[model samples]
Target: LECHNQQSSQTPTTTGCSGGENNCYKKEWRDNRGYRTERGCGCPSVKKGIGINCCTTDRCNN
Candidate 1:
């Protein structure tokens, strides 16, 4: 699973993931469109404020 939030307080945007590929970080908010957009950012890194999970299966547990 992955989780994210508004990168900028001025924009007031946020994003997150429950269970899926590591591409959760790629998700972002589109200012002009006022919608969520993905930049192929893919995966959340510890530096980006994400933690790694250990699962025996490919799927994630919540």
Candidate 2:
């Protein structure tokens, strides 16, 4: 499947995934930049102070 892959703002970056059970995910957090977001295709490893959401579908991370 294909998902959105970006470290911050821009879009149109398509990230492809394997047949693995991995899914699309978006992570949000704060740093020196005040607010930050990340979109990727894989299993999510949630951490403290970071909000992450994942879904199963092409470009679902968007």
Candidate 3:
């Protein structure tokens, strides 16, 4: 799960997930150990307003 700051439009997007289920699905600002590396707030409920309707899914790409 590669996280990117869509607003930056630059290369080397934020580091991606390592396929760890516990870490990959985490989505809380306070609970995120990788918050500093996050592009947005990292909260599943927080919408950034500039992306697809849903989070990125391996099948949907949204």
Q: Encode model 1's per-residue lDDT on 27-50: one tens digit a residue.
A: 344456465433222444445332
Badly placed stretches (over 4 Å) of model 3 are 10-12, 17-41, 44-54, 58-62
List per-prediction Cα lDDT, in the order shown: 0.36, 0.77, 0.34
Better of 1 and 3 by TM-score: 3
- Model 3: lDDT of residue 61: 18
Candidate 2, RMSD to the unseen true structure:
2.3
Comparison by lDDT, 1 against 3, better one: 1
Q: What is the TM-score of each candidate against the true structure?
A: 0.20, 0.71, 0.24
Q: C-alpha displacement of 35 in model 3, angstroms?
A: 24
Error of 3 at 62 (Å): 9.7
Residue 49, candidate 2: alpha-carbon lDDT: 76
Alpha-carbon RMSD of each model: 10.9, 2.3, 10.0
In the range 1-62, model 2's lDDT, one tens digit per residue, is: 87887677666577777767568878888876688878876766757778888888887876
The number of residue pairs in model 2 that clash at the backbone is 0
Candidate 3 per-residue C-alpha lDDT over 1-62 given as tens digits, one digit per residue, 9 for 90 to 100: 55443332334235455545212222223333532122432334446533323355431211
43 in model 2: Cα distance from truth in Å?
2.7
The ten-residue window of minimal lDDT in model 2 covers: 6-15
